[PDB]
Design a protein around this ligand. Structure first.
Ligand code: HEM
Ligand code: HEM
Ligand code: HEM
Ligand code: HEM
Ligand code: CA
Ligand code: CA
Ligand code: CA
Ligand code: CA
Ligand code: CA
Ligand code: ZN
Ligand code: ZN
Ligand code: ZN
Ligand code: ZN
Lengths: 106, 106, 106, 106
């Protein structure tokens, strides 16, 4: 899918995690986010489409998804350990990653 | 896409890179590899379909792709610096990652 | 420094971030957290002293540190952008990583 | 030790790895390179001494070590599996990383 739909799936599952009851739903949510993140990591934001694929700006953009993906990785460990509250706290915290990139390249 | 189709993409582009005349071709092939690895990374291999998403094997499987994507990342740096030869040698080098994963999960 | 002392440095600055009032203070503490983290990453914990330095356990142990440093790195971004509270929430959040390794390897 | 001592250690073990006759010798050499790389990663290079601690230059400097450490990580896996020739090829290939950072900051 394209950034749009991946960002959508990404955003949706954040709400799923926030309203999740058990670990399986959060785990399931994070997994879907992981998939959306990895798929979107190969796209080029409309504001950098005129920038070199490997310019200072694009390397930062790519770096951004790496951060998010790492945050989703750590979150999964928590959810896997049955730590639902900690996992939801990590989902909220990684929200800064979402915002930071948007401020820069959205 | 099916795990094998991504593997086919990975395999062919290794050839494209080896036969490349210029930086443009190595980068193009490297970027397609990045995309294939990332899609591959979301898949559940036949030999591990019985395991849980949270298991030493699946965590190791995921790690293998982080290794590959990171190597593709380094290769891309050399290519965007004009070092066509070094980028080609890097693609040759990461073949070891391909073999290492296969010996365990293929 | 040794593993044990770097851990102290880590815990002390975590409290500095908690009591911090400006971005300057948080950046400095995080900076120190990264150095003590990178420094401690080379060590072998007493719980795994007698075990292949290439064992599954040492690999997992090292992974835990990557997660920690990875989190400190993102927290540093926030701090560098002048987002005190956002960075403070990141320091809080990564406590979960400290916890996870301790229960398993300390 | 300082940046300079860590760089010497990196260079020595590169030579050890080249002449190594077995897997144990290579693992030992890579392990030392790992510690030296991580030790150096915390240092501010003379050429970046007047830059702000969180400037693009320092972020790029840090990224370079991440790459080097990742390459050592992959090489260790090779060595750990007894693939001596492959690990040595890995060590020689990462020399491109040594080069790239030197070109920019040495
Ligand atoms: C969990 C975190 C994230 C969430 C929940 C999220 C959510 C969204 C949403 C809902 C949109 C609007 C899509 C639309 O216009 O239909 C969007 C757009 C966008 N996001 Fe994110 N995002 C996240 C992280 C990121 C990150 C880390 C980056 C950059 C590295 C990023 C870059 C963008 C860009 C460039 C757009 C505009 C895409 C376009 O206009 O086609 N996002 N995001
Ligand atoms: C760039 C390096 C790589 C190349 C060139 C490559 C190439 C291939 C090829 C040609 C196949 C057979 C596809 C088929 O039967 O249709 C294959 C299978 C496979 N590869 Fe890779 N691969 C690479 C990296 C990896 C990595 C890093 C992993 C694991 C972390 C991996 C896991 C697998 C698995 C599990 C299969 C078996 C799939 C099945 O039997 O359905 N490969 N790969
Ligand atoms: C920011 C997070 C962390 C903090 C604040 C922290 C803090 C500490 C502190 C203060 C101690 C001393 C315990 C005592 O008084 O007996 C300690 C010991 C230890 N920590 Fe951590 N730690 C953190 C993360 C980690 C991680 C990520 C790992 C593993 C990857 C880890 C592994 C250990 C081990 C193995 C010891 C025992 C060392 C010894 O007694 O020889 N810690 N940690
Ligand atoms: C295996 C790879 C590497 C080897 C073999 C290596 C080797 C060396 C050597 C022999 C020196 C000269 C030491 C001296 O003058 O006392 C040096 C200097 C330096 N290296 Fe590396 N290096 C490697 C990787 C890197 C990387 C990845 C970076 C940056 C990300 C880097 C940054 C520097 C800097 C900044 C200096 C200047 C030190 C000074 O003059 O104070 N090196 N390196
Ligand atoms: Ca199949
Ligand atoms: Ca073909
Ligand atoms: Ca093309
Ligand atoms: Ca002490
Ligand atoms: Ca010198
Ligand atoms: Zn993990
Ligand atoms: Zn890079
Ligand atoms: Zn960064
Ligand atoms: Zn590994």
């Amino acid at each position: 899918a394209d950034l749009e739909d991946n960002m959508e799936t990404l955003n949706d599952n954040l709400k799923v995690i926030e309203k999740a009851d058990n670990a399986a739903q959060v785990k399931d949510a994070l997994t879907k986010m992981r998939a959306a993140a990895l798929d979107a990591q190969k796209a080029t934001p409309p504001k950098l489409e005129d920038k070199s694929p490997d310019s200072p700006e694009m390397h930062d953009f790519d770096h951004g998804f790496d951060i998010l993906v790492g945050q989703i990785h750590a979150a999964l460990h928590l959810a896997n350990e049955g730590k639902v509250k900690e996992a939801q706290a990590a989902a909220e915290q990684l929200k800064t990653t979402c915002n930071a990139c948007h401020q820069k390249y959205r």
